[PDB]
């Protein structure tokens, strides 16, 4: 027997997220001591991003830009960075380099997608924008998603430099420079990353799709929070616990 009609229902909550607070805002963090932000209870409304965006790269892992509306995401986190384009290729999973060893290790098992656009008209500075700071030596390399905010003076010999600068003794921190007429590969980039899990979990952020009424005891094409199928919907006596 074939189905006759579709039934679509989603939670009745609408407010602007907004994305502009994440993307559009100014003076975001340096590469270390980066920041994490959490987003809930809003309409997805990506179409404004599709129209407005001029971003020079999109790449997504485990998801595609078509089939992106009509998805409900259980948790959303956004991370913002100031970066030099070689690091922009480095931010991919599995790579090697200063970033992947020292700063912002990113796991190969990941479901998000990462966006970059070039900020040279704003981030660069005549005389250099020294405020962007990065770390050059560490005794071992970090596991994914944790920060360090530290200073313990690096020793490059058998003898100590006694917590002060001297022979074979370096301060671990150094400053990027970006200028007018910058090297096109060197010049600064801004990168944003989003991370989520797409299944088996109550969600709050759902796409811009209107709900309809549901009809019982008929073969229908249903969509509940992205889960589709064909079948007869009937009453049940299964007492689900609050997290299920």
């Amino acid at each position, epitope marked *: 027997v074939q189905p006759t009609e579709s039934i679509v229902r989603f939670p009745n909550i609408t407010n602007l997220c907004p994305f502009g607070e994440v993307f559009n805002a100014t003076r975001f963090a340096s590469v270390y001591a980066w920041n994490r932000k959490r987003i809930s209870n809003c309409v997805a409304d990506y179409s404004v991003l599709y129209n407005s965006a001029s971003f020079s790269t999109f790449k997504c892992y485990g998801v595609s830009p078509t089939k992106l509306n009509d998805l409900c995401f259980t948790n959303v986190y956004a991370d913002s960075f100031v970066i030099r384009g070689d690091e922009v290729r480095q931010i991919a999973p599995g790579q090697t380099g200063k970033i992947a060893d020292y700063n912002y290790k990113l796991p190969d098992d990941f479901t998000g997608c990462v966006i970059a656009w070039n900020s040279n*008209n704003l981030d660069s500075k005549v*005389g250099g924008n020294y405020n962007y700071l990065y770390r050059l030596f560490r005794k071992s390399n970090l596991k994914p998603f944790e920060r360090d905010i530290s200073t313990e003076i690096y020793q490059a010999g058998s003898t100590p430099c006694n917590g002060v600068e001297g022979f074979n003794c370096y301060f671990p921190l150094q400053s990027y420079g970006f200028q007018p007429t910058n090297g096109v590969g060197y010049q600064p980039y801004r990168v944003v990353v989003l991370s989520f899990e797409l299944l088996h979990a109550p969600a709050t952020v759902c796409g811009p799709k209107k709900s309809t009424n549901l009809v019982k005891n008929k073969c229908v094409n249903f969509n509940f929070n992205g889960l589709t199928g064909t079948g007869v919907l009937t009453e049940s006596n299964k007492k689900f616990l609050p997290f299920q």
Partner: antibody, heavy 113, light 105 residues
Framework: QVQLKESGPGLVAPSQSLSITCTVS????????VHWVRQPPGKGLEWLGV???????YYNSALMSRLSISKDNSKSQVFLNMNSLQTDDTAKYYC??????????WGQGTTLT | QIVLTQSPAIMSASPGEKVTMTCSAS?????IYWYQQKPGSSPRLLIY???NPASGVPVRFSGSGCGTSYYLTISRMEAEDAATYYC?????????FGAGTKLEL
């Protein structure tokens, strides 16, 4: 002290040429950068500026004929020369240095035309 | 980028009559530096990024702006005599100097 000082300022003539030099002490021209700014009488200032370690040059100008930087890189002085500068320009000429930031120091020279 | 400036002509009856200075710019500018001048003789002294002061200037200053428009606010004492202000942008060449005229008596 860290100092900027102005030396051989231009003096009145019927001839429309004018010369001015500025001299620096307490820092080397290889260690920081110095920027050069001009004011017409009764008007805001006008700017020529360049950022370098040494030997580099940058310019933007509404006119550039006969015009490029002139420099005596023994730390002695920096020099300016134009055929018609007396009528065209330079009631006052100013000598100024910049660093990374919040270390910016200015010197003022007065040109007779 | 070209930048454009407005100023009043005004007669005071006391200090504490609040004062504003404004600049408007032809295109997006990200970084600006803040400067004050006394008439008659023209040394230069600077108030820099994040609107923090240099040495040798009164503490009562604060600056915050919005795109294509920059504002800082001053309340009391000598600035009524001493303040003439210029606005300049340092993101890309040429570094246009800007123009204007301001007075209080």
């Amino acid at each position: 002290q860290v100092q900027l000082k102005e030396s051989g300022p231009g003096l009145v003539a019927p001839s429309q040429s004018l010369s001015i030099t500025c001299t620096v002490s307490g820092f080397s021209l290889t260690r920081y950068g110095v920027h050069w700014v001009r004011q017409p009488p009764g008007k805001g200032l006008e700017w020529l500026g360049v950022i370098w370690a040494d030997g580099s040059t940058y310019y933007n100008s509404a006119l550039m004929s006969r015009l490029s930087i002139s420099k005596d890189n023994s730390k002695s002085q920096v020099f300016l020369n134009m055929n018609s500068l007396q009528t065209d320009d330079t009631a006052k000429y100013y000598c100024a240095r910049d660093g990374r930031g919040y270390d910016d120091y200015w010197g003022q020279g007065t040109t007779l035309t | 980028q070209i930048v454009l400036t407005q100023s009043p002509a005004i007669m005071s009856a006391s200090p504490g009559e609040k004062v504003t200075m404004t600049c408007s710019a032809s295109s997006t500018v990200s970084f600006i530096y803040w400067y004050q001048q006394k008439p008659g003789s023209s040394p230069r002294l600077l108030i820099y990024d994040t609107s923090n002061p240099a040495s040798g200037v009164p503490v009562r200053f604060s600056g915050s702006g919005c795109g294509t428009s920059y504002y800082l606010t001053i309340s009391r004492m000598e600035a009524e005599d001493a303040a003439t202000y210029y606005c300049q942008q340092w993101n890309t060449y040429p570094l246009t100097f800007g123009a204007g005229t301001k007075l209080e008596l």
